[PDB]
């Protein structure tokens, strides 16, 4: 019954609340996407656009929650770029060892940070890992986590090493499948990093709309924004 353009009209305020809260670049992308839905001819076109708003918005609220910079997909560093600029003396060996798996060089996680296209800087990798493991242990939230480790090497107290933190996030119904597939994809490069002597942590997590509002990986305020906007939109596209 309701035309798609009319569906966007009734959700004007929830989506304006959404755009106001997201980071600058994240908000513009979701706004452009919203206008594609409003002008969409086919139901397939509108659905695909809404899917992308769902992911882009969620990642914008993940950045705000963790005080990380939101990075558009286009500006996101690959693994190869991270090794070249953070571990330049090992980039050659990184290339040689990825001869049989060259796709590894192009892996682009949602967040690619290193300890303090550009790799972002974070004050403590282990603090981020702990935060994730705490919420996982406290609210039962599925995560997967892996750390490079050359042979059986001990951590050390007399010298610091550079290290990377690789993070995958997502907003989708199959949370367990998301984190299982992410860690499987990265297990290969973790093993590679071990053999190069490069310290990396990989973390993956996911939320869906059935998650209790106080239990997401994003602030509860942001949960209400997504639920009142993109989530309702999906319900309206299906009925109409």
């Amino acid at each position, epitope marked *: 019954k309701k035309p798609i353009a009319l569906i966007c009209a009734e959700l004007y305020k929830p989506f304006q609340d959404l755009f106001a809260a997201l980071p600058k670049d994240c908000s513009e992308e979701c706004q452009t996407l919203f206008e594609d839905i409003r002008n969409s001819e086919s139901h397939a076109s509108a659905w695909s656009s809404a899917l992308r708003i769902k992911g882009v918005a969620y990642e914008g609220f993940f950045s705000l929650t963790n005080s990380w910079r939101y990075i558009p997909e286009d500006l996101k560093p690959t693994l190869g770029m991270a090794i070249q600029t953070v571990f330049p003396d090992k980039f050659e060996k990184f290339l040689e060892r990825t001869h049989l798996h060259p796709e590894y060089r192009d892996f682009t996680p949602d967040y690619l940070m290193c300890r303090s296209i550009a790799v972002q800087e974070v004050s403590s990798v*282990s603090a981020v890992v*702990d935060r994730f493991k705490s919420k996982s242990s406290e609210k039962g939230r599925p995560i997967r986590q892996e750390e490079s480790r*050359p*042979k*059986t*090497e*001990s*951590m*050390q*107290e*007399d*010298i610091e*090493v550079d290290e990377l933190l690789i993070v995958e996030v997502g907003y989708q119904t199959d949370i367990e499948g998301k984190v299982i597939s992410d860690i499987e994809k990265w297990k290969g490069v973790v093993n590679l990093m071990s053999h190069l*002597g490069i310290k990396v942590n990989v973390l993956t997590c996911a939320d869906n709309s059935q998650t209790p509002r106080t239990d997401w990986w994003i602030d509860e305020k942001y949960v209400r924004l997504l639920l009142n906007s993109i989530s309702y939109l999906f319900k309206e596209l299906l009925e109409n």
Partner: antibody
Amino acid sequence: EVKLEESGGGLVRPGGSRKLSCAASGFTFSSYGMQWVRQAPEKGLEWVAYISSGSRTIYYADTVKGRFTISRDNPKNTLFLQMTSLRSEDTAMYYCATGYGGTWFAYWGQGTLVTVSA
Amino acid sequence: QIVLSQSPLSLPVSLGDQASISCRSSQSLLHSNGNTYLHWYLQKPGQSPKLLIYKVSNRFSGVPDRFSGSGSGTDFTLKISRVEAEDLGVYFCSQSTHVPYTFGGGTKLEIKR
């Protein structure tokens, strides 16, 4: 002067439990990893456990895994070893130690004797 | 686990002579951070162990300069340039590159008479 002072040793029945403490002084305890090392009578040294300064990283010898827990209280400058399911093979002098800047054993306590026997 | 093999098991040496103790590692002790965590201890009879040398060749502060260490990879040596009566006891190498940290079996330094 750096000093480590173990306590809590004594006699335990096999299968029993015992908690060791180590009081640290003379340096900023909270900044450094701490370790437990043991020595069975007339035998060599055997490393037991390591705990990082912020307790984030913990390592155990394979013979104590599942039975011993290392922990610390940084405000109280104290290191702990909680021992459970003790066996006669755990009879030993227990030393706490620290590298005061690394994973080597630069400083050692005087040790505390734990005897596991019925 | 890393196995550390000390030789000889016991070392008779006259006062004033040099002593050399060898420590062989079952795998390289070079850490990916560039350091080599092989260390040397002395346990005098009835006392707790004492650090002599850390990371291969660094004499611990206050250790007599007659003690020195050398080596790389899997092959390491502790030298006492001129043995004194106080050096009686058991010398241990140990490594902290890999978990578990492990000790050599000990070399007893015996004073020749």
